[PDB]
Design an enzyme around this catalytic site. Structure first.
Site, short mmCIF file in Angstrom:
data_model
loop_
_atom_site.label_atom_id
_atom_site.label_comp_id
_atom_site.label_asym_id
_atom_site.label_seq_id
_atom_site.Cartn_x
_atom_site.Cartn_y
_atom_site.Cartn_z
N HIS B 350 -10.91 -8.53 15.25
CA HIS B 350 -10.09 -7.99 14.52
C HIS B 350 -10.72 -6.05 14.65
CE1 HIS B 350 -7.87 -10.92 12.63
NE2 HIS B 350 -7.70 -10.62 12.64
N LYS B 541 -3.58 2.24 2.08
CA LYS B 541 -4.84 1.57 2.80
C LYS B 541 -6.34 1.67 2.33
CE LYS B 541 -2.96 2.61 6.81
NZ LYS B 541 -3.12 2.15 7.94
N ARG B 542 -6.98 0.81 1.99
CA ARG B 542 -8.35 0.81 2.21
C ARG B 542 -8.88 1.94 1.59
NH1 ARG B 542 -13.11 -1.44 5.69
NH2 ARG B 542 -15.13 -0.82 4.47
N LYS B 547 -10.45 6.08 6.96
CA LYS B 547 -9.48 5.77 6.85
C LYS B 547 -8.36 7.14 6.43
CE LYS B 547 -7.84 1.45 7.34
NZ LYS B 547 -8.03 0.39 8.23
N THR B 649 -1.25 -3.36 10.26
CA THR B 649 0.23 -4.21 9.72
C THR B 649 0.98 -3.70 9.15
OG1 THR B 649 0.17 -6.45 10.52
CG2 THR B 649 -0.59 -6.14 8.07
N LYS B 653 5.46 -2.44 8.61
CA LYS B 653 6.20 -2.29 7.31
C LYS B 653 7.34 -1.14 6.99
CE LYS B 653 2.63 -5.74 5.40
NZ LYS B 653 1.62 -5.75 4.32
#
Ligand SMILES: O=c1[nH]cnc2c1ncn2[C@@H]1O[C@H](COP(=O)(O)O)[C@@H](O)[C@H]1O
Ligand SMILES: O=c1[nH]cnc2c1ncn2[C@@H]1O[C@H](COP(=O)(O)O)[C@@H](O)[C@H]1O
EC number: 2.4.1.1
Lengths: 812, 810
Positions: B350, B541-542, B547, B649, B653
Site C-alpha cells: 500500500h 483525510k488523515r 495530504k 479509496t 466514494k
C-alpha cells in the site's frame, strides 16, 4: 405513546408445552449459542436447555418486579459474602413445574436430561453452611412472597476444587465461569463507583472524602424462583472492574487494575487488606442500589426504615452501618441523630459463632488508610454508644472498656461485632442454646444494656432442594399419605406419625433408602472406581475438616471396630460403610493430616481379607452441594459429633433427618432442638454435655488417665505410633498422637468410651429393620420445625416487620 | 439417533412477517435483555432490534458454513490488522431485505428506527483506508459467493475518539464495547495458545521451541452478510487472555498478565515490542485455525484449498510461521513446505516511499521469536542462492535483495520477506503497481516479473451508495433498475440520460435533499448557521503534511481576504468542511487542526462575510460520519502532492455520490479521470514528473512567495497573529515549515489550485452544466466497485471463480 403498550410480556412464554420447549431449545442452540448439531457438545446442549428454562424464569421475574413496584412493599436486603448456590437447572424446573415437560422434550430430541444436568458447575460463590444458609433463605423468601434481594460478590474461582492424590489433599482452581453462566445477566448500564484510600477534609457544612481511588462495581442479576407460586426474586452479584484511563508520565499503576480486579477473583480465606476491600466493595455498591431503589417509587428518609430492611449475615458486611451513616450524613445532609435512628431501625445482625476468639476485628491503622472517613464515623458511634452505657450504668468503668467498639492493646483494633450490635435494632443467634450463650457469656454486657434486642432464629433448610429435589422417592411416598402440600408446609409431616404402625408405609420408607443406597453405590463406581456393599449401614460424616468437628473421634471408632473384627473374626458384627467427606483449609496443617489419616485407615481396612466387606472406609472427595444431595438421601446414620458447645447450630443435621437417617450426636447446636422434637428416645445422644465441658476445664483435662483405663484406646494409639497405618513412613502420624495425647483441646479421648458404646446400640437397632424404620419415620414426621420456611416467617414477623404470603401471583 | 435430526434450524421466524418481527422484538427485550418498557432505554430498544435482525443473520450463517463443509471449497483468509467495520444494523437489514419490515415493525411498536440506528457505536476496529478496504472486500467477497474469512484482532478501545476542545484535538478512549457488541459471539471453547520468547533446542529429529511464555487467543465471531444472496461469511477476531495458575513468589506474573492483555487493548497509532507481539499474535492464532479447518492428510492439497492474503506487511510473519508449523510440527521437509508457503500466500503493498516499508531489528526478533529468526535466515540464504545463480558475480544485487538489511542496527526487511514468500505481489493502483516494478522493487521484478500485479482499489456500492444515499439509489433504479447494485458497471447506461431534464433535476434534487439533512445535523452540534445553498466543499483525510489540508487553508483564507476586500462582489457561497484525525505524537498535524478551527473562529463570526463563507472542522471523522457527509458533498478535495498517494479509496466514494473532484494527478485520481474523461474533472497542479523536476533543481519556496502578493498577505496574517490574536506566535512553526522545510511544495501548487477553484465556483453558478458533469462522473464510476477488485483477486490470484448465485434457507 399508547402503541408502546404492545411492548408487553403478554404472550411470550405462551405455554409450558412439550412442542414449545423443543422449539426454544433449537432457537437457543442455534441463535443464542450460534451452534448446530454437527458441532454441539453436551455442554452446548446443556446451555441451550438452561436458556430454554431461563425464559420461563425471566417472564415470571418481570411480573414479580412489576408487582413490587405496583404494591411498593417493604423491601428486604440479605447481605452475605457467601452464596452456596449449587446447581440451578433442576431446582428451577421443580419450582416452575417444568420437570416432566423438559425430560419429555429432551428425550424426544435424543438426549438424556441427566447427562446434561451433571455438566453444570456448582456455582463457585460459597464455601460452608454460612453460604448454604443464605441459599435456602432466598428460596424460602421467594416461596413466602417477600420482596427480597440477595446481595453479594460474584466470585470467579470460588473456593478451590479438592483433588485427593495419594491420600493428600490438593487444591485446584475452580474456574466455574470459564464457559460463562446462562443463569446470570450482566448489567453494565448499572455500574457504580466504589472509593478507597484518599483522606478526609473537614470543611464548612461537613466532611468531604477526597482524592480517592475508584473501583467499579458492575452487577449481574440471577433470578431466584419461589415454589410453584410464580414469584421470582433477584440475586444481585457485584463484579469489580478497574476504570479505563487513556497525567501521562508512568503506567506503574498497573498495580491498581490488578488489585482492583481480585476483589472479585477469589473467596476467603485471619485478615489481609484484600478481605477488607471485599467487604467494603459489596457494602458500598449495595447501599447505592438500595437508596436508588428507595428514591424511585411513584427526599424523605423518615419512611426509610419502613421500606428497607438490611440483614447482616455475620460481621462481614458490618461496614453497611458506617456506610449508611456516611451517605445519610455526608451526602444527603441529614444530621447524626436522625441518620442514626434510621440506621439502627434499618439494620439487623445474625451471629454464627460460639467462641469469642472467632469474631471479626480489624486494626485501626488499616481502616485509617483505606476508609479514613469510616474510621471517624466508627469513633463517633463509639463516643455516643459508650455515653448511653455510662448513663445506664454510672460508675462501672470496666463496662465502658469491655463494650467499646475500640479494643486496646499492642495493636489498636475495631471489634466489628460490637459495631453490628450498637447499630442493629435486632441481633440473633442461630439456634436456641447458641442464642442463649450469646446472651449469657459472649455479649452479656450488651444484653444487659438492651435485653429486648436479642433474639433467636433457629436455622432451617429448604424442603425443595433438600427433599423434593434430591429425594423424590421419599417425597413421592409421603405425598400418597398426605398430598403434595407439605412441600410448602413441613409442619404437616406430623400427619405421618399416624402411619408408624402401618406396615406398607414401613417397607415403603425402607425401600426408598435401599434404592438411594443403590444409586449412590453405583455412582461411586462410575466415577472413582471403588467397591461398595449396598446392604451395609451407611455411616456418613460430612462436615468441614476441623479438630473440634472430631472426625478423629470417628476414626477412633472405625479402628476400634476394625480391631474387634480381628480379635473376634467369627463374631457377627453389623456391616458398615463409614464415609467421611469435607474440605480442609489450606495452611491448616492438622486437617491435612486428618484426611491423610482417613485414607490410610481406608488403605488398610478395604484390602484386608479378614475384614472382607463387613467394614469399609471411604473418604468422599470434593464435598459440595450437589454431592450433598447425592449422599444425604443415601445415609442411614448422621454423624454430628462435635464437642458440646462448639457448634452454634448446624444444618447438615437437618438434611439427614429429613432424609431418613438417624442421628448419633452430642447435646449441641441444633441437635438439642432436634432431639426435643423427635424425643430423646429417637436420637442417639451421647457423651459430655456443655456442663461437663466446663467441669473438665475446671479440674483440668488429663488425657493420659483415659489411655490407662481403656486398653483399646492404648492399642489404637500404639498402631498409629509404630506405623500400622503408615508402614512406609512409621512416624508420619506423630503430631496427631501428640495432639490427642498432650494438647487435645477438644477432648477426643474423653467421649470415646460413651461414644463406642452408643455406636453398639445403633448397630443392634439396625439389626432390627422394622424397629429401625419406625424410629426413622418418627424422625421424618417431626422434622417440620427445621424448614427454612418456618425460620424466614419468624424473621419476617419478629425482625423485618412484614407478613409472609403463599398466594400465587397471576400470569404468565 | 434419528431423534437427533430434530435438532435443526428449520423453525425460526419466516420472515418478512412484520407480525413475527414484532413478536421476536418482544422476545428479545424481555428474555434476552431482561428489561421491559417500564425501564427500557432507547439503547435497550436498539439491542432488542439488533438481536431480532441477528436471528435471521445467524440462520443464514449456519447454512453458509454447513454448505462450505459439504462442498469443501477453496477457502480464502484475509489477514488484516484493521477492520473498519462501522455500524452493522442497517447494512444487515438491506443485505437481507429486512429493512422495510423492521421499519414497519418498529413503527407499529411506537418506535423510530432511525433514532435507534444512531445509538449503535462504530466498531472500534480500524483506523484509515487500509481498514475500510478490508471491510469493503468482506462485503464483496460475500456478495460474490467466495468462501472468505476475515481474520484480525478484537481491539477493546479501538483507536481513540477525537474531541475538539479549544480548537485542539483531544483523544478520549473509545469503549465501544461498554455495553457489549450484539453482533459478536465469544468462543471461549476455541481458545488457542500463542507462544513468545523463550528458546530453540536442536534434537536430532527436529527443532523444538521450548521455555516459552504463553498468551491465550480467544476468538469472537461476527457474521458478514452477502447482498441478498444468502451467503453469510465469518469475521474471526482474536482477543488476548492471560492464563491462570494460583506457589509464589514472585508476583511479576502480574506484569505478564498485563503485557499479555495490552496486545488486544489498542490499535496503533516509539517503535514498540508490543506491535510485533500484536503481529505474531494474529498470525499464530489464525494459522492454527486455518490448519485445523484443512484437516477437519497430506499438505499437497493445501495451496489448492487455502489462500492467505497479506494486507500490507503486518501479517508478514505468516510466512515464517507457516514454515515453522510445516517443518517443525507437521514434519514436512524444507523444500516441500517452501513450495506450499510460496503458493498459499499472496501479498498486497500500500506504500509509495522506500522508507515506509516495515522493518524489525534482529536483536528484537532474536529475543521474542528465536525460531522464526532462524527460519528467516534460512529463507534468505536459499533465496539469495537463486539470486547469485540468476545473476552471476552480481555482488551488488545480493546486498540489495537480502531480507537482512545492515546499518547501525541489523534489521529484517519485512517487505522482502513478503515478496520471497509470495507468488503474487499486488499493488493497489496502476501508477503505484508500476512504480513497484520501476524503482522500489525493480531488483525483485527482474527475477520474478510474473510475480508483480495490479489490483486497483474499489469500494462497495452497498454501504457507499445504497445504504448512505437511498435517494440517489432510488432515482437510478427508476431508470435502469436495481441490477447495478451488484454490477456497478451498468451505471454506464446513465450516459443516455445526460440531456434528460427529468433526470438532471432529479439528481440535483437528491443532492439538495442530502445537504438539508446534513446542514440540520451540522446546525445542532457546532452552533452555526449553514447556508444549504452554498457549495459543500469537503476534505476528509488523515491529517498530514503531504495530504495537504494546509493548501486548502490557503485557499480558504484567500477567499476570506477577497470577500473582506470587496464585500459587494458576487461570490459563490461555500461551506468549507475539513475532517480527519491526527496521529498522537504528530505535532504538525495537531497544529494544522488548530489552524483549521482558528480560521473558523474568525470567518464564521465576521459580520462582513454574512453567510458566504463558513469553515468547519468535522469532529471525530469515522465510518458513520463519512456516510453522512459524503452524500452531501459537491466538491471532493483530493489534493495530495503528486506521487505521494498510492490510491485513495474515499475519492471513489465522492464520485459515486455526486461530488465533482478537485485534485492532483496521482493515486486513484488518474484512473478516475481516465474513466470519466479529464474534461469532467478539475485536475490541477504539478504532475509526478513535474515534482521530480522541481526536486532536481531544488525547491525554493521564496520564489513562489515572491511572485504572488495574495500568498504574501496570508502568511503575514498567520505570522502577525491575525488568526490567533491572544497568541501572535501560535502558528510560527507552521510558517517556518511552509517557508523553509516544506517537503511537500504547497506554495508551488498554490497559484494553479486557486485558478482551478474559480473554475469550480464558475461552473457551480450554472446548475444544469454542473449536474450534467456530475452525471458523467456517476455513470462512469463502476470500475471502482469492490466487486470488480475482488473478482480480479479471485481469478488472477486466488484462483477461485466468483458466483452471483443465490442460496436457500428453509
Ligand atoms: O417503575 C417501574 N414500574 C414497573 N416495574 C419496574 C419499574 N422499575 C423497575 N421495574 C421492574 O424491576 C426491574 C428492575 O429492577 P430495579 O433494579 O429495582 O430498577 C425491571 O426489570 C422492571 O421489570
Ligand atoms: O463437519 C461439519 N458438518 C457440517 N457443518 C460444519 C462441520 N464443521 C463445521 N461446520 C460448521 O461451521 C461453523 C463454524 O465452524 P468452523 O468452520 O470450524 O469455524 C459451525 O457453526 C458449523 O455449523
Amino acid at each position: 405513546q399508547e402503541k408502546r403498550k404492545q411492548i408487553s410480556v403478554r404472550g411470550l412464554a405462551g405455554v409450558e408445552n412439550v412442542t414449545e420447549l423443543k422449539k426454544n431449545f433449537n432457537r437457543h442452540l442455534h441463535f443464542t449459542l450460534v451452534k448446530d448439531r454437527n458441532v454441539a457438545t453436551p455442554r452446548d446442549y446443556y446451555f441451550a436447555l438452561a436458556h430454554t428454562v431461563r425464559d420461563h424464569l425471566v417472564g415470571r421475574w418481570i411480573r414479580t418486579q412489576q408487582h413490587y413496584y405496583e404494591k411498593d412493599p417493604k423491601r428486604i436486603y440479605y447481605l452475605s459474602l457467601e452464596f452456596y448456590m449449587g446447581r440451578t437447572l433442576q431446582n428451577t424446573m421443580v419450582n416452575l413445574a417444568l420437570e416432566n415437560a423438559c425430560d419429555e422434550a429432551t428425550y424426544q430430541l435424543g438426549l438424556d436430561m441427566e447427562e446434561l444436568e451433571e455438566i453444570e458447575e456448582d456455582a463457585g460463590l460459597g464455601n460452608g453452611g454460612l453460604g448454604r444458609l443464605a441459599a435456602c433463605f432466598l428460596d424460602s423468601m421467594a416461596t413466602l412472597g417477600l420482596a427480597a434481594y440477595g446481595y453479594g460478590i460474584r466470585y470467579e474461582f470460588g473456593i478451590f476444587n479438592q483433588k485427593i492424590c495419594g491420600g493428600w489433599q490438593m487444591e485446584e482452581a475452580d474456574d466455574w465461569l470459564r464457559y460463562g453462566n446462562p443463569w446470570e445477566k450482566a448489567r453494565p448500564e448499572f455500574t457504580l463507583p466504589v472509593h478507597f484510600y484518599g483522606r478526609v477534609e473537614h470543611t464548612s457544612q461537613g466532611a468531604k472524602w477526597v482524592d480517592t481511588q475508584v473501583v467499579l462495581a458492575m452487577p449481574y442479576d440471577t433470578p431466584v424462583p419461589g415454589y410453584r407460586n410464580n414469584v421470582v426474586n433477584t440475586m444481585r452479584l457485584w463484579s469489580a472492574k478497574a476504570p479505563n484511563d487513556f497525567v501521562g508520565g508512568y503506567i506503574q499503576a498497573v498495580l491498581d487494575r490488578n488489585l482492583a480486579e481480585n476483589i472479585s477473583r477469589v473467596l476467603y480465606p485471619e485478615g489481609k487488606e484484600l478481605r477488607l476491600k471485599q467487604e467494603y466493595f459489596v457494602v458500598a455498591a449495595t447501599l447505592q442500589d438500595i437508596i436508588r431503589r428507595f428514591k424511585s417509587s411513584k427526599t424523605n428518609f423518615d419512611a426509610f426504615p419502613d421500606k428497607v430492611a438490611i440483614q447482616l449475615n455475620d460481621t462481614h458486611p458490618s461496614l453497611a452501618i458506617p456506610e449508611l451513616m456516611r451517605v445519610l450524613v455526608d451526602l444527603e445532609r441529614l444530621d447524626w441523630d436522625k441518620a442514626w435512628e434510621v440506621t439502627v431501625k434499618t439494620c439487623a445482625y445474625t451471629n454464627h459463632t460460639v467462641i469469642p476468639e472467632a469474631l471479626e476485628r480489624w486494626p485501626v491503622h488499616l481502616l485509617e488508610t483505606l476508609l479514613p472517613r469510616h474510621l471517624q464515623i466508627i469513633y463517633e458511634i463509639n463516643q455516643r454508644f459508650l455515653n448511653r452505657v455510662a448513663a445506664a450504668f454510672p460508675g462501672d468503668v470496666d463496662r465502658l472498656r469491655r463494650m467499646s467498639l475500640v479494643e486496646e492493646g499492642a495493636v489498636k483494633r475495631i471489634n466489628m461485632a460490637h459495631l453490628c450490635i450498637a447499630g442493629s435494632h435486632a441481633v440473633n443467634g442461630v439456634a436456641r442454646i447458641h442464642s442463649e450463650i450469646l446472651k449469657k457469656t459472649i455479649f452479656k454486657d450488651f444484653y444487659e444494656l438492651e435485653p429486648h434486642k436479642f433474639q433467636n432464629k433457629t436455622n432451617g433448610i429448604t424442603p425443595r432442594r433438600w427433599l423434593v429435589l434430591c429425594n423424590p422417592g421419599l417425597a413421592e411416598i409421603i405425598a400418597e399419605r398426605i398430598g403434595e402440600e407439605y412441600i410448602s408446609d413441613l409442619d404437616q409431616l406430623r400427619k405421618l406419625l399416624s402411619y408408624v404402625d402401618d406396615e406398607a408405609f414401613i417397607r415403603d420408607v425402607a425401600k426408598v433408602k435401599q434404592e438411594n443406597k443403590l444409586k449412590f453405590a453405583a455412582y461411586l463406581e462410575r466415577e472413582y472406581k471403588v467397591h461398595i456393599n449396598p446392604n451395609s449401614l451407611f455411616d456418613v460424616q460430612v462436615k468441614r475438616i476441623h479438630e473440634y468437628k472430631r472426625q478423629l473421634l470417628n476414626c477412633l471408632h472405625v479402628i476400634t471396630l476394625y480391631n474387634r473384627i480381628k480379635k473376634e473374626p467369627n463374631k457377627f458384627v453389623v456391616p458398615r460403610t463409614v464415609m467421611i467427606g469435607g474440605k480442609a483449609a489450606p495452611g491448616y496443617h492438622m486437617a491435612k493430616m486428618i484426611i491423610k489419616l482417613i485414607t490410610a485407615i481406608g488403605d488398610v481396612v478395604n484390602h484386608d481379607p479378614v475384614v472382607g466387606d463387613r467394614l469399609r472406609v471411604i473418604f468422599l472427595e470434593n464435598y459440595r452441594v450437589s454431592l450433598a444431595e447425592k449422599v444425604i438421601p443415601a445415609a442411614d446414620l448422621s454423624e454430628q459429633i462435635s464437642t458440646a458447645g462448639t457448634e452454634a447450630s448446624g444444618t447438615g443435621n437437618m438434611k439427614f433427618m429429613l432424609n431418613g437417617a438417624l442421628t448419633i450426636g452430642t447435646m449441641d447446636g441444633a441437635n438439642v432442638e432436634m432431639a426435643e422434637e423427635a424425643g430423646e428416645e429417637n436420637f442417639f445422644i451421647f457423651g459430655m454435655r456443655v456442663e461437663d465441658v466446663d467441669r473438665l476445664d475446671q479440674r483440668g483435662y488429663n488425657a493420659q488417665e483415659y489411655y490407662d483405663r481403656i486398653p483399646e484406646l492404648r492399642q489404637i494409639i500404639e498402631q498409629l505410633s509404630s506405623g500400622f497405618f503408615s508402614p512406609k513412613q512409621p512416624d508420619l502420624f506423630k503430631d496427631i498422637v501428640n495432639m490427642l495425647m498432650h494438647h487435645d483441646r477438644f477432648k477426643v479421648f474423653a467421649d470415646y468410651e460413651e461414644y463406642v458404646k452408643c455406636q453398639e446400640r445403633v448397630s443392634a437397632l439396625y439389626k432390627n429393620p422394622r424397629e429401625w424404620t419406625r424410629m426413622v419415620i418418627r424422625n421424618i414426621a417431626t422434622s417440620g420445625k427445621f424448614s427454612s420456611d418456618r425460620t424466614i416467617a419468624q424473621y419476617a414477623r419478629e425482625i423485618w416487620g412484614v407478613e409472609p404470603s403463599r398466594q400465587r401471583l397471576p400470569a404468565p
